[PDB]
Design a protein around this nucleic acid. Structure first.
Ligand SMILES: [Mg+2]
Ligand SMILES: [Mg+2]
Ligand SMILES: [Mg+2]
Ligand SMILES: [Mg+2]
Ligand SMILES: [Mg+2]
Ligand SMILES: [Mg+2]
Ligand SMILES: [Mg+2]
Ligand SMILES: [Mg+2]
Ligand SMILES: [Mg+2]
Ligand SMILES: [Mg+2]
Ligand SMILES: [Mg+2]
Ligand SMILES: [Mg+2]
Ligand SMILES: [Mg+2]
Ligand SMILES: [Mg+2]
Ligand SMILES: [Mg+2]
Ligand SMILES: [Mg+2]
Ligand SMILES: [Mg+2]
Ligand SMILES: [Zn+2]
Lengths: 71, 104, 124, 138, 208, 83
RNA sequence: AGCUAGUUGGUGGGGUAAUGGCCCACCAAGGCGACGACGGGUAGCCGGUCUGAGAGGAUGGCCGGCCACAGGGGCACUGAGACACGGGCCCCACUCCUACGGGAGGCAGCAGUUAGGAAUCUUCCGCAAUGGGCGCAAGCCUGACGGAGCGACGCCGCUUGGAGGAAGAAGCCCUUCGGGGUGUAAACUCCUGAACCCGGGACGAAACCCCCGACGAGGGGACUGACGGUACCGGGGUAAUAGCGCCGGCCAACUCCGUGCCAGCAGCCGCGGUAAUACGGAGGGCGCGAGCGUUACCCGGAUUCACUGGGCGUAAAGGGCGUGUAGGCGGCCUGGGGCGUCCCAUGUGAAAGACCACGGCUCAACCGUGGGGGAGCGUGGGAUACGCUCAGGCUAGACG
């Protein structure tokens, strides 16, 4: 099925944590742990610690999000 | 039948009582090797009669004191500290293994 | 070892160690949710597994996995833990029975419904 | 010292036969000779005789073998494919006549030592007795 | 309770022909007649080499699906033949062949095993007089297996016992078509039965 | 007081007693001193009562005191018949 | 890793049914321990049970045997017997009554309530049967017991039908668009006839008692069922529940669609980042079937604690080396003993369960009867090869 309570809000890469991990601060309100989307990692697309990025956030855990749009 | 046993009188220090050291033998239940186990019985000797080193037959008796249910039935063979030895020395080793140790 | 050695020291029976302190070795244990967060998979997996800290009646407070398409698990929602690790979520040794207590069963299930506490779909 | 004579013998035999010696010596003892008696009887060895090596008594044990073989490794088949001590000092093995094993589905034998002498298993079973289970052989 | 459902699909899956219907299963229609392949959307696709398991599983499923019996019963029956002396393979078949519902079928009282079951259930059968409606009743040597007098007028019992005129019977049996009786002479032996089964496998399957 | 009574060994709706000799204080189905017979209240087999009368007589020879029913069954197998 | 002062023994006395440091006075200085004392932890023990090829491992509900306890602690009284679950006293805790002085309680009996918990039943019927206490007896008491009740909790039995019926409906799935599958499955015809209605209706119960007979043996008579108007019997009679798990491999069962390292699966290896037999549904299939699946725990697989039956040069594993205590092990010949060891007889190894046989209930589950097996230990008799022991001898080990 796949519910639809997902979101695409944007933000900026803050920290450059380990294993394709980032502090990404949502333009919206705060920042989340944000991990690099599979797609994106498969197509490489390095991601500097200060880029505007798109996030996929499950209301289930706003605290986390996946980076969708590369830059 | 009142169980009868045999052993060496390793202790003579009491009044009207002797310590008989009955040695037992039997196969170990799982490993089967025959193993020699043993135990001390305080046999009743009213006449002092039996002295340290003797081999006596012990006989199941009516309680005589707490921890004492055997009477010396008869002497099998007199004197033989070679056995009292084993005992004493074994005890003496104890007097070590704990914090310091016992001379070899 | 020599036979004599065996007689002396002998073999040591193995001690099994429970992998589910659902205490009192119960089959299930019920508790209350503390947090209904989400966690990331391990070594080679990616996804947002739904998880939940649980205060057990057994006194313990553990992390349980929420099986299914989508739950309705909140906070003070009473739930029943059932034990079952999850290779991707370390620190997660139990699954949460769906269809018991505050854990509503999976809606729109038509297959292994029993393992998702969802009644028989009244087919017309 | 020579810790276990009976094993020492079976081993010498096992060792010699493995390299196909014709004969082979072993320090004699009544008990040892007795066992060989069965060995000979059951046809595991050609037989044996009392000899004097360097002044002390031994027992030549004339070994026996299958015939020459074909293709690679014409080495004969063994007559004594097996032979193992069972009762060993510091681990004696006694059996009741009902607990007497049947070596190799009967094709092999086991030599017991009973108060009725040193008989094989059939001999013991027949005579309704048990004893130390000296060794199996097949 | 017993299988109940399309039966010739089993016939097909088991490859071998099973007579779970009596008539027709002789007519050019047991489907194993032009369609000896398994049921379902893949029936005609190539068969990959079956696994040791597969084989044993299938052999058992076969034998069992023949006498139409619950794995539960089938198994216990097996475990029984196992304990009893005598080559298990045989003993087992002998026991399956001792079920009342089977004999009623082996005596032409019924067209098929299923039907015989029902006859037993609806009390149309006799065992030395007293009627017995337990399809799993163990018929044993000496037992006469009649037909309910009351039922002796039933068209079915008539048609059945009619065509039975002429037809011979198993050598471990014997039936008197007149009074609609028959005796269970002896437990049939492996040779006596001609089941498309390799019971050495069925034994091995319960080995695992 | 040692007695001679029945011990229930049947099963629901299927009673089968055992004419036993047991001290008077034991559970009716407890450890008995000796069995000496059996009894099938429903006579579901030709043989539905046996009594080692040799034995009975012995126990009675020593204070055995039978239940009224136990005495019944006994009598019924000439336990006392002194012809 | 050391423990011990009533602690170990003795003499006298108390005490009990009785032996005893059980208790006491006096005397002696003993008693226990690495063959593991003392201390800590955990636990009622057993017949058995579960698993296992076995050895073994695990277990000790229900049934039978024993023990311990009866809110926690202590104590005695009465008695053949108790330190006495529905007897007594005291202390503690808790509860209820209290005119505040003081009193009353104890379901770990049946049922039931409440609490805790994932979770465990009826405040039922009966005393007819079996058994128990009292009574000369009639009889009274009996939540022991016999039954019914609820719960697929387990085991066994049984039904949802049977036979016919297209080169094969429709719908749904797939298609190489020819067709293939669901499938004789259905529809339909015919047959039988669970439920259900009617009638009959039980074994279990023959004693105690009464009469003849002497209150004996023996013979006759009477009363008595909860279950139950149930079991079962006979007549009538309806085609009349099916679900659950699984189909990547271990492992029996494959395709289309949806999704797109997401949502999710997951026991392990792993699967999912646009052709996914591994996710979600569908068609089809495999397996079981009033069950099916899950979780938990035990045995198995695991010769992965290896007695059966494992090992240590480099994988985990030789002690840094020696001297040496205890202990383990012990060359050749002969004699005594007969402790081990072997044999025979005999006693014990309860019943139940296990195994076999026959039998009872339509079968089976369940149950009855009979038979066989059974380690261990007791007693008597025997054997002596090996082991032990004792004695004698020897030089092949060792020492000089
Ligand atoms: Mg989604
Ligand atoms: Mg406890
Ligand atoms: Mg094993
Ligand atoms: Mg008194
Ligand atoms: Mg009470
Ligand atoms: Mg009564
Ligand atoms: Mg009464
Ligand atoms: Mg497969
Ligand atoms: Mg796809
Ligand atoms: Mg093992
Ligand atoms: Mg080993
Ligand atoms: Mg290894
Ligand atoms: Mg290493
Ligand atoms: Mg070294
Ligand atoms: Mg020697
Ligand atoms: Mg002896
Ligand atoms: Mg029968
Ligand atoms: Zn067919």
């Amino acid at each position: 099925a796949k519910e639809k309570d997902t979101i695409r809000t944007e933000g900026v890469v803050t920290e450059a944590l380990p294993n394709a991990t980032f502090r990404v601060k949502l333009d919206s309100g705060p920042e989340i742990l944000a991990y690099i989307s599979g797609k994106m990692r498969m197509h490489y697309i390095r991601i500097l610690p200060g880029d505007r990025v798109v996030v996929e956030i499950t209301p289930y855990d706003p605290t986390r999000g996946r980076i969708v749009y590369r830059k | 039948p009142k169980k009868v046993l045999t052993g060496v009188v390793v202790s003579d220090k009491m009044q009207k009582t002797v310590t008989v050291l009955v040695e037992r033998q039997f196969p170990h239940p799982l490993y089967g090797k025959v193993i020699k186990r043993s135990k001390k019985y305080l046999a009743h000797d009213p006449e002092e009669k039996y002295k340290l080193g003797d081999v006596v037959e012990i006989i199941e008796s009516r309680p005589i004191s707490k921890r004492k249910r055997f009477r010396v039935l008869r002497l099998v063979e007199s004197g033989r500290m070679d056995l009292v030895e084993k005992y004493l020395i074994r005890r003496q080793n104890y007097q070590s293994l704990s914090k310091r140790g016992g001379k070899a | 070892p020599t036979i004599n050695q065996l007689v002396r020291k002998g073999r040591e029976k193995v001690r099994k160690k429970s992998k589910v302190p659902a205490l009192k070795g119960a089959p299930f244990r019920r508790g209350v949710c503390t947090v209904v967060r989400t966690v990331t998979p391990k070594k080679p997996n990616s996804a947002l597994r739904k998880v939940a800290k649980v205060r057990l009646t057994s006194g313990y407070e553990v992390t349980a996995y929420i099986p299914g398409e989508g739950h309705n698990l909140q906070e003070h929602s009473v739930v029943l833990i059932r034990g079952g690790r999850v290779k991707d979520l370390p620190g997660v040794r139990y699954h949460i029975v769906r269809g018991v207590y505050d854990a509503a069963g999976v809606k729109d299930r038509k297959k292994s419904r029993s393992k998702y506490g969802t009644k028989k779909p009244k087919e017309a | 010292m020579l810790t276990d004579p009976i094993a020492d013998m079976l081993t010498r035999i096992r060792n010699a036969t493995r390299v196909y010696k014709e004969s082979t010596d072993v320090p004699a003892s009544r008990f040892k000779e007795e066992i060989l008696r069965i060995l000979a009887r059951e046809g595991f060895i050609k037989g044996y005789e009392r000899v004097d090596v360097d002044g002390k008594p031994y027992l030549r044990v004339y070994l026996k073998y299958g015939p020459r073989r074909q293709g690679p490794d014409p080495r004969p088949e063994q007559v004594i494919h097996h032979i193992r001590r069972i009762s060993k000092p510091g681990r004696r093995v006694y059996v009741g006549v009902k607990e007497i094993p049947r070596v190799r589905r009967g094709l092999g034998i086991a030599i017991l030592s009973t108060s009725k002498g040193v008989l094989t298993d059939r001999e013991a079973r027949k005579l309704g007795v048990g004893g130390e289970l000296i060794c199996e052989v097949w | 309770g017993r299988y109940i459902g399309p039966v010739c699909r089993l016939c097909r899956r088991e490859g071998v022909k099973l007579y779970l219907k009596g008539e027709r299963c002789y007519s050019p229609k047991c489907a194993m007649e032009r369609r000896p392949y398994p049921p379902g959307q893949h029936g005609q696709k190539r068969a990959r080499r079956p696994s040791d398991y597969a084989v044993r599983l299938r052999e058992k499923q076969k034998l069992r699906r023949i006498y139409g019996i619950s794995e539960r019963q089938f198994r216990n029956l097996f475990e029984e033949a196992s304990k009893k002396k005598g080559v298990t393979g045989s003993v087992f078949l002998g026991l399956l062949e001792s079920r009342l519902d089977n004999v009623v079928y082996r005596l032409g009282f019924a067209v098929s095993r299923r039907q015989a079951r029902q006859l037993v259930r609806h009390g149309h059968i006799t065992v030395n007089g007293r009627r017995v409606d337990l399809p799993s009743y163990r018929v044993r040597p000496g037992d006469e297996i009649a037909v309910a007098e009351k039922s002796r007028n039933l068209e079915l019992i008539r048609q059945n016992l009619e065509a039975m005129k002429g037809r011979k019977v198993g050598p471990w049996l014997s039936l008197d078509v007149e009074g609609m009786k028959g005796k269970f002479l002896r437990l049939p032996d492996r040779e006596d039965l001609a089941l498309p089964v390799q019971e050495n496998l069925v034994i091995e399957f319960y080995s695992r | 007081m040692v007695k001679i009574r029945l011990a229930r060994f049947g099963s629901k709706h299927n009673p089968h007693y055992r004419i036993v000799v047991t001290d008077a204080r034991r559970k009716r189905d407890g450890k008995y001193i000796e069995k000496i017979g059996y009894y099938d209240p429903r006579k579901t087999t030709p043989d539905w009562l046996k009594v080692d009368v040799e034995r009975a007589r012995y126990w009675l020879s020593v204070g055995a005191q039978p239940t009224d029913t136990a005495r019944r069954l006994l009598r019924q197998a000439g336990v006392f018949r002194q012809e």
